[model samples]
Target: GSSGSSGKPYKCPQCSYASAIKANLNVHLRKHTGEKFACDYCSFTCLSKGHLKVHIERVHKKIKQHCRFCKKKYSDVKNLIKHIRDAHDPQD
Candidate 1:
C-alpha cells in the first residue's frame, strides 16, 4: 500500500516516531513533548497558549533598548546593531 512511501515512513530523530508526512510528524512530536518551552527573559512557561499569553502580559514587561546612534527604541539588540551599521556608518 503506497500512500506515499514505498515501504516505511519518516521518523523523527527527536522522539523516534514515524509519520507518513512531515507535517503529521511535527504535530505528533509536539504532542509528546519533553521540555516545556521557556522564555530567555525569565523563567516563565505555559505549554497551553492561554497561560503563555498571561505570562507574557504579566511578567514579560518591555524595557525596550534604545539605539545610541539613532535614539530609537528597539525590541531586540541585534536589530539595533544592524540599524546602527546600516544607517549610521556608510560603507567605504
Candidate 2:
C-alpha cells in the first residue's frame, strides 16, 4: 500500500515490517529490542503502555462487569454485552 501523504515509507531494517509513519516504525522496533511495559502487579508484559494500564486496571484492580444472569464477571462492558447476546439473548 502507498504511504498516503508523503509516499516515503518507513522501512524496518530488522525485518520485513514497514510503516507509513516514523513513530509507528519506532514503536515496532520495540519488539526487536525486547522493550515492553510490564504490569506492576503481575508478570504480564505489553508492547504499549496503554495495554499495560488496561491490564492492571481490569485484571489486577478488577474494574469489570458482573453478569447477573450467570453470576460471572467480565473485564469489559463489550465482553459482557457479547456474553449476554450469545448466551442469554431471548431473541436469538
Candidate 3:
C-alpha cells in the first residue's frame, strides 16, 4: 500500500533526499560525492557509463551528423536539427 510505514523509502545520509528505489538513491548520491566513471581521452566524468560512451563517440571517435543544407557537422542529430532550424530557416 501507499500508506505511511507500509513502504520503505531509501534516505540519503548526506542530504534530505529520498527515493522509493535504492538505485535512484545511489544515482542521486553521485551528485553530492562525484562519479566513478571517467573518460580516458579527456577529463570528462559522469555518473553513468552511457554518458562516457557518447563523449567518446563525439569527441574521440568523432562520429557526428551533418547538416544537409549547409554541410555543417554536429555531434548529434539534435544539434544538427537546431542548426538547420536556426541558421537555414525557410522563413528567411
Candidate 4:
C-alpha cells in the first residue's frame, strides 16, 4: 500500500489537479475550498490526517504509549515492537 508510482498525490475532485493529497482529505480539500476539519477529543483543527498526525507526533510529543506487556496503550505497533526489542528483550 505504501509503494505505488503516482507522483502527484492529494488530488481534487473538482479540478483533478494532484499536488500532495496526503493521507488526510480535510487539509487537501482546504487547498480547493479553504475549509478545515479536526479531531473531536482535542478539538484540534487541520486539513489532513497527515498534518494531524504530524502535530500529534511533533507538537504533542508527550502523547503517551502503553506498555507492550500490558497492551493498554501505544503510539503504534512499530513503537511497541521497538520497545519490546530494545527495552524488554535484547535477544529478540
Which of 2 and 4 is ahead in TM-score?
Answer: 4
The best-first sequence of candidates by TM-score reads 4, 2, 3, 1
What lDDT score goes with residue 24 in model 1?
A: 87
Top of the candidates by TM-score: 4
Q: Distance (Å) between predicted and true CA of 35, model 1?
A: 6.0
lDDT string, candidate 4, 1-92, tens digits:
97877677666664555664465556666566665556544767775667777776666564566774856577565577677776677653
Task: By lDDT, rank the candidates, best first.
Answer: 2, 3, 1, 4
RMSD each, Å: 12.2, 12.1, 12.1, 13.4
> Which pairs of residues clash in candidate 4, taking residues 3 or more apart in a chain or in different chains?
9-21, 10-20, 10-21, 26-47, 27-47, 27-48, 66-73, 66-74
> lDDT at 66 for candidate 1?
88
TM, every model: 0.29, 0.32, 0.31, 0.37
Tell me the tens digit of each residue's lDDT in model 2 across 1-92.
67566753789876688887899899988777765787887778776778788887778764567899998989866788889988998863
Tell how far residue 39 is off in model 3, in angstroms.
0.2
For candidate 3, write residues 1-92 as lDDT tens digits. 66757443789875689888999989988887765578987777766888778888777774577777888888867677777788897875
The deviation in Å at residue 66 for candidate 1 is 5.8
lDDT values, one for every candidate: 0.70, 0.79, 0.77, 0.64
Clashes of 3: 0
